[PDB]
């Protein structure tokens, strides 16, 4: 909430993980000159910091995109969940990030109360509030924790998609005990023996 506000491409900007992949695509506000991002690959011959080679542009963008993809190959992992029984929340199940309360606000706009009759307020007050945090948690096994959570979050579709795919790829390769048993028994030619 100010006068001029924009959106900008910042890879993993809201990553609250102890895990750093360190190939992130960071872009500055259009206000400031992002020239350097787009001259990286082939502008060998054109040393001048202000200027970039137009012809080299499709190439350079194509790599950027490549790396956007790669520094996003990521298992979205569940943290913990809290039963938000309060005034601000409709008994809503919020992600309790072990630190930095800040993040919650940003992750959940809907949480916020209305002091003014302002442009932003107006928007927020015309939108469907209930969809904040966790609608369903997925485990049936009694005395074990959950397999997954289903949470309405501030989340980037494109990034989601990337991560979704990756998971589907991983899942495809994943093997169950029995089959593993097989593999080993076969390889062993019964000479060697494992406990099923």
């Amino acid at each position: 909430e100010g006068a001029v506000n924009r959106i900008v491409c910042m890879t993993n900007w809201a990553s609250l993980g102890d895990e750093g992949r360190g190939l992130e695509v960071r872009l500055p506000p259009p206000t400031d000159s992002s020239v350097h991002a787009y001259k990286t690959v082939l502008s060998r011959g054109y040393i001048d910091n202000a200027q970039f080679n137009p012809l080299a542009l499709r190439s350079n963008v194509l790599l950027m995109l490549l790396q956007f993809t790669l520094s996003n190959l990521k298992i979205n992992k569940s943290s913990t969940f809290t039963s938000d029984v309060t005034t601000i929340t409709s008994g809503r199940m919020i992600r309790a990030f072990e630190g930095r309360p800040e993040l919650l606000a940003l992750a959940y706009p809907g949480r916020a109360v209305l002091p003014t009759q302002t442009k932003n307020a107006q928007f927020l007050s015309t939108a469907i509030a209930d969809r904040i945090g966790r609608l369903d948690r997925a485990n049936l096994i009694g005395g074990e924790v959950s397999a997954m959570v289903e949470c309405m979050e501030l989340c980037d579709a494109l990034t989601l998609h990337i991560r979704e795919t990756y998971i589907m790829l991983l899942r495809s390769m994943h093997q169950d005990p029995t089959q593993i048993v097989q593999i080993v028994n076969e390889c062993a030619n019964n000479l060697l023996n494992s406990t099923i």
Binding site: A138, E164, R171, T178
Partner: protein, 412 residues
């Protein structure tokens, strides 16, 4: 295992001079892809109903399903031809069918075989039969084709409940997968079955078949929290909007009444809505894998079948296994299921039954309108990236309640 006459059926065209796609669409396909193997297709399908199934080319998952088949259908006629044809776009990357190649340079002589609506016998082509091993993964794909293409409806899915000798090993393993949706299990299965030139080892096979039943049984009503296959049923998660995702669930209530011995059905979906129902589709893909192993009772007899797909080789008959196909309209079934549930007194209709019937009515409407609106384009342009079908097809009929009742009695 090598079921010699592995004859597979390519799709007809909707009163079209050409197979179902335009050049641009096929270009898209061949070219933007490479391998003739379902990896790419499955990639799309897998993403647990999140991503909208809509695109410029590909209206639904099922859409892609159909152009996958037609692609197949057209480009096989090349190499599966009597003396080998292949040009216009596709000249096969090696005789062993390795990859979808744009016409090799100094290679014109193998024509583009202009076929009509024609079944082919894979093993009658010497190249094909030589390469019996590599043939195996693609046959799987083939079946998928055939078993949509046979008809003008939603997929012809097969069911099997072998009762009594049930492997203890199967039980044990299968339990570990508890928590996951049918979709991902299917995916692994197909992948395995392809990856290894297919085995007589009934393990895999049995497992898929049981799974299929449990799903179907679930979906009907017969199977639920309190009436289980020993613990087994599929749980329809999220009781509001129609996305009620069938996860494998193991809860001990009762062990449902062991049927008499061997129970077999096949289902089709009469209503175009099948398209947006990943559940339905995923059973059908399961039953294909089954096929590769097993010589299923000679296909759904021509009584419910368009004229072009009558008298097919050794497929349709008249006095065989499963003469009639079990047929449904998806939205009436959900009602059916709630019926049973209520009849059992599992639940009050009061709020539960009302609510979900309300949501599925909505979902119907949305679907119906989208499928119609999309079909409008192909039903005016030379291009077809979609199932062909009239507004009267949506009809609440097509033997919907009979199916349900049969499925149930099957469980006895």
């Amino acid at each position: 295992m090598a079921q010699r006459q592995f004859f597979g059926l390519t799709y007809n065209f909707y009163g079209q001079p050409a197979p179902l796609f335009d050049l641009n669409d096929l270009q898209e396909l061949a070219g933007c892809y490479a391998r003739p193997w379902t990896s790419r297709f499955s990639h799309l399908a897998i993403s647990t109903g999140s991503l909208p199934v809509w695109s410029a080319r590909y209206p639904s998952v099922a859409s892609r399903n159909i152009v996958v088949n037609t692609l197949l259908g057209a480009h096989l006629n090349p190499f599966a031809g009597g003396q080998i044809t292949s040009h216009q776009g596709i000249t096969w990357r090696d005789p062993v069918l390795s990859s979808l190649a744009p016409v090799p340079a100094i290679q014109p002589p193998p024509v583009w075989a202009v076929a009509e609506n024609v079944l082919l016998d894979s093993n009658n082509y010497p190249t094909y039969v030589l390469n019996l091993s590599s043939m195996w993964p693609i046959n799987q794909d083939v079946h998928i084709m055939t078993m949509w293409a046979l008809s003008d409806q939603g997929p012809i899915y097969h069911l099997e409940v072998p009762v009594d000798p049930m492997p203890a090993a199967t039980t044990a393993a299968l339990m570990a997968y508890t928590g996951v949706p049918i979709a991902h299990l299917a995916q692994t299965a197909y992948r395995f079955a392809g990856q290894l030139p297919q085995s007589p080892d009934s393990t895999m096979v049995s497992t898929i078949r049981w799974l299929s039943a449990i799903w179907f049984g679930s979906l009907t009503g017969r199977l639920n929290r309190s009436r289980t296959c020993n613990g087994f049923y599929f749980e329809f998660a999220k009781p509001a909007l129609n996305p009620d995702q069938a996860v494998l669930k193991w809860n001990d209530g009762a062990r449902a009444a062991p049927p008499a011995a061997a129970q077999s059905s096949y289902i089709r979906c009469i209503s175009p809505h099948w398209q947006h129902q990943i559940v339905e589709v995923a059973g059908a893909l399961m039953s294909q894998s089954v096929t590769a192993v097993t010589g299923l009772p000679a296909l759904i007899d021509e009584a419910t079948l368009p004229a072009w797909s009558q008298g097919v080789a050794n497929l349709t008959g008249n006095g065989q296994g499963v003469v009639p196909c079990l047929d449904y309209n998806p939205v009436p079934m959900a009602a059916a299921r709630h019926l049973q549930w209520r009849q059992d007194g599992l639940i009050t209709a009061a709020q539960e039954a009302q609510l979900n019937n309300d949501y599925t009515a909505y979902a119907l409407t949305i679907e119906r309108h989208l499928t119609a609106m999309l079909v409008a384009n192909p039903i005016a342009a030379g291009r077809m990236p979609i199932q062909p079908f009239n507004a009267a097809d949506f009809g609440q009929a097509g033997q919907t309640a009979a199916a349900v009742a049969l499925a149930q009695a099957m469980f006895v």
